Write a protein that binds this ligand. Structure first.
Ligand SMILES: CC1(C)OCc2c(Nc3n[nH]c4c(Cl)cccc34)nc(-c3cn[nH]c3)nc21
Length: 298
């Protein structure tokens, strides 16, 4: 097939500064930083990832496989790699998404998330997913935790650089380890459910081993209180046994876009209209010569 002509950018350690830790886990440590190129008179807000501390040959392999996938994509609703740093332990550089992941965002800002935002996010996620489809790239781990927030009005898919989350998996994935663009549609349905419930845990309390039987019986995730039969029907469609019967991401873009034009007709949120999230007003944004990675291209 088509040669992958993507450019792998190597960044000098002296060109970027680590400000603070955003998160620390099994993957290692993620830092909030600033990338100051050569003498370009620009300061790019970045996120720097590093393999904890130790350097084992197999760990570097796994982080370079992520760099490969991340550098191979370019879409407004998909997270991209800015570059790699070849220190003792390899470092991944990517654009800073100041509001963190969507799952934490909806849990922490539920009292100000209106129907417009929820529906716009659904369009945005489907658009990224449709790009991943056009590029023949299957996510395998789509969930609200794997959707980063640039601005509350702009979200981007991440962690597709995996190519077990049973409660987000399609039936063919659990039983036969089948991962397709249609199995990502099921995971998308669970992601929408996560947003609509304002970050609730799917099948909370129920063990992972029982999920297979629950799904095979015909039981699915409940109708979120704010969901009209219109939105919920779409979620239900994503959770069908027949993968070809499930909607396509281009169908999901259209359907959610139709709904986003009259958001109060499709999502009933009490207190909606009087709700507002941080937007480019007063204090949305050193801080001199700062430019976003989306506007900086060499
Ligand atoms: C702390 C939290 C929310 O958890 C983990 C993680 C993460 N993981 C990454 N995955 N891939 C990355 C690359 Cl290539 C570079 C830098 C970070 C990552 N990335 C971010 C992030 C923030 N702004 N932009 C990316 N945030 C998080």
């Amino acid at each position: 097939e088509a040669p992958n002509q993507a450019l792998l950018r190597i960044l000098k350690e002296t060109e970027f500064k680590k400000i603070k830790v955003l998160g620390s886990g099994a993957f290692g440590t993620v830092y909030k930083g600033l990338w100051i190129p050569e003498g370009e008179k620009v300061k790019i807000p970045v996120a720097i990832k590093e393999l904890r501390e130790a350097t084992s040959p197999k760990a570097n392999k796994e982080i370079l496989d992520e760099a490969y996938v991340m550098a191979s994509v370019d879409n407004p609703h998909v997270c991209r790699l800015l570059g790699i740093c070849l220190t003792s332990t390899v470092q991944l550089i990517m654009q800073l998404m100041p509001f963190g992941c969507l799952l934490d965002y909806v849990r922490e800002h539920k009292d100000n998330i209106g129907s417009q935002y929820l529906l716009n996010w659904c369009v945005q996620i489907a658009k990224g997913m449709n790009y991943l489809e056009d590029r023949r790239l299957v996510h395998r781990d789509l969930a609200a935790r794997n959707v980063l927030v640039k601005t509350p009005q702009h979200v981007k898919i991440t962690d597709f650089g995996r190519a077990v989350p049973i409660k987000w998996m399609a039936l063919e994935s659990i039983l036969h380890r089948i991962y397709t663009h249609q199995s990502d549609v099921w995971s998308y349905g669970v992601t929408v459910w996560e947003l609509m419930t304002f970050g609730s845990k799917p099948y909370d309390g129920i063990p992972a081993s029982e999920i297979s039987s629950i799904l095979e019986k015909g039981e699915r995730l409940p109708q979120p209180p704010i969901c009209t039969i219109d939105v919920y029907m779409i979620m239900v469609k994503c959770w069908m046994i027949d993968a070809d019967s499930r909607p396509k991401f281009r169908e999901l873009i259209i359907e959610f876009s139709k709904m986003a034009r009259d958001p109060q007709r499709y999502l009933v949120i009490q207190g909606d209209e009087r709700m507002h999230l941080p937007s480019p007003t007063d204090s949305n944004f050193d801080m001199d010569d700062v430019v976003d990675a989306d506007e900086y291209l060499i």
